[model samples]
Target: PLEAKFEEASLFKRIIDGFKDCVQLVNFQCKEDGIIAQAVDDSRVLLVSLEIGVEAFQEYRCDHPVTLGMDLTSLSKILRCGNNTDTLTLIADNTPDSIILLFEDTKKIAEYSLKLMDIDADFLKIEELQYDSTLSLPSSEFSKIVRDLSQLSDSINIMITETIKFVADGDIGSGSVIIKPFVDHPETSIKLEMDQPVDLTFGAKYLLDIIKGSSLSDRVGIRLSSEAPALFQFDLKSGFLQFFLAPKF
Candidate 1:
């Protein structure tokens, strides 16, 4: 780990531009390692997590190893879209106080500050966006599941063995919301655990997108089981985030 002053780089702005059509979801947490966030884009899986060693940009440094979990699609977005020239650095903790994004270059340094507020114990707050829906999942387990999906494929046919349920991977086939994610196999699978066997079908893309909105944790805690509306959760740097999916037939 090395220490450096603010450098001009606008990684998020570039990422947001590239994935303009895609909804941007961020997963963050404050842990012993440090604070980190993972942001994804549409049609691309550029997973970049930067750990902060200090609370202020003037005192902070990107000294830790990046625990990257994104696929080539996302990787290209970061490398190609995110301007390597503008080094956006953090000047303050993204807490209730003001959070400033700093960009530094040989010519001059620039900064942008967005006032923040203390989040209620129940409200999930980030920068300025307040999450209306947030659930908790087993982070460690969820990461494994995301990897499985990436190694798989863009889409696949799935058959849950427990009750012979079939699901086509897409947005409209199974539920009101459309899910887009990367799966590893033509017939991607998840060996689900429940108290008893129940048959259900859902789009893998939806599941992947929901899963993508989680921390890099070990286990994914899904709320809606075979009979109930599902809630998926995972952990990140400072807070807990979740997703709720309505059940299928």
Candidate 2:
């Protein structure tokens, strides 16, 4: 038997929404520590790692660790019924055939039962990477940069120097945005430790998708090196979300 309650339904819903676009099914491991999930997209270009600690929940109990395979789209539909202020409860059993979700507010309650499936997915063994540059910036600003650059080109070139730069080229011309650190706003911390500056190119659409999941956090962390995969991190209440995107040629 297993049951968990989230103080706010919106928090959990946002986490689920992040994975629905690239991953259709995912296996959630519920353990004493918390819930953890890792999945790579069908194209194998992106990987998402998620963890929500037990302390993030209002109440959580799991007699033993359990893995539940769930359809993200269906689960998201069910969560849509919940209000931001409502409490969300998830219940499962050893059989793991189905999952029951309950959303309760002060005066009303809504429940849903979703069928589970057997997913054949293996988590990638990701090694700790030594990054040449790391940037912690406002999610809103990053989102805006990606949005504006995407309009100019399908891909964006990122260069690290005295300032972080984003450049895009299209039929009309080339456009670029330069970012510098602000002493007052420490969240916009930009650190580049390298013998030589690094330059890389990546798909704009994927960057937008990764940044969109960072809505809950005021700041998002980015790590990258020349011609290597990039890691984007967003810190949640008691856990964090990470997205890895392989660089494009």
Candidate 3:
């Protein structure tokens, strides 16, 4: 099957979130498994990435590795133009060495541009990405995840201090969830008193930030365990995207 163009949209959005760090991200080297980015604030930390493939765009091929030196802050600003629109155009220029993206719809038109001083640009191609499970989850599950994450933005530091633990207590056949706060954050704490008990620890900040982009759905289906890698499942029309993260001790 041939890869679809929608993957490009997701990839670009992920890059935007990586740039939200303290330092401005300048250059990035994107590969098949994930992406590595360097921020101006701290060059040592290369932002690593792992793409949880989307089901709808599986056919799109990305073989060759591409490295693009970008102005992280500016790059993110320009990529904000995309919404639910199906057709999106990106233009590259050499005179001032800049990139521009144009988003057009039946009703309105929006344009965003970014200028680069020294850009060692390489062609970004889709590499073969193999996932263990192309998860199929309900839209309602994805929506709830996003809604829960969004609540963190308005919260104070104390509230954000809370860690959301996903606990599954009991035997394999009989288990229950215990979603509670680790620290003493009164605001972010979620008290779930189930009939049974469970076990798991997760940082609320990451969950909140990650799921914020998943607001496209009404609810988010989660596939995870105490030891195994956590999988957050969501569907985009015909296909699906699962966001996975290793369990935190």
Candidate 4:
């Protein structure tokens, strides 16, 4: 048997909402440590990695590790039935074909049962990547930058030097957003750490999608190397959510 309860469902809600953008079906791995999930978009250009720590739950118990294939769209729909005031509990029995969710409030409780599927373990393989250039900035600021750049070009170029820079160019015109130190707004400073300067280009649309669903976080962190896949991270209280995107040629 497996059971887990959380005092607040906000984290789960945000995770599900963000995950649904890339894939319709996701495999949730329930282990003694916690619940972990990973999925790549149909285009295979984007990846989502999730981790929910045991500390994040009010109660967690699992006799052993198990993987449950869930339809994200369906699970998300059921989650919509819950409100902010409600708490959530996930329950499953050994050899079960379906999982049950309980949403409880001060006065009432709602239960939802959803069917599960079987996914080949080979489908969930993800390549481990390491980055040399990384930075942490407000998620809203990053989202705004991506949104603004998309208006001018289909792709955006990122470069790091004395400061972090974003450039968008096309037949129409060119625009660039520069985040520098001792020059731009002193109130907001971008924390950048790089072994050496790195530059890369990526589709604006993919970036927009990546940050859009991750807006729940106060700040977002990104790690990238020259022309390499980038890792976007959102830190949670107990764990973190990461999104990986391939660079555009």
Q: Write the per-residue lDDT of candidate 4 for residues 1-249, one digit (tens) a residue.
A: 899987877657877887677776788899999988888888888888888899988888988788899989999888888786578889998886999988888775788998999976555444445566888777888889999888899989988876799999977888899986342453355678877787889988788778866545777888987656788888776878888888887
The per-prediction CA RMSD against the true structure, in angstroms, equals: 12.0, 1.7, 11.6, 2.5
Report the C-alpha lDDT of model 3 over 130-154, residue by residue, as the tens digit: 3222222334343354345334442
| Candidate 4, residue 104: how far the Cα is off, in Å | 0.3
Winning model by lDDT = 2
Comparing 2 and 3 on lDDT, the stronger one: 2
Question: Which scores greater on TM-score, model 3 or model 4?
Answer: 4
Q: Compute each candidate's TM-score over C-alphas.
A: 0.35, 0.93, 0.43, 0.91
Lowest summed lDDT across 10 adjacent residues in model 1 is found at 123-132
For model 2, give the 10-residue run with minimal summed lDDT: 187-196
Candidate 2: lDDT of 218? Answer: 81
Regions more than 4 Å wrong, model 2:
185-196
- Compared with the true structure, the alpha-carbon lDDT of candidate 2 equals 0.83
Give candidate 1's whole-model lDDT.
0.39
Instruction: Give the candidate order by descending TM-score.
Output: 2, 4, 3, 1
Writing each residue's lDDT as its tens digit, candidate 1 over 4-32 gives 33332343343333223233443333343
Once all C-alphas are superposed, what RMSD does model 4 give against the true structure?
2.5
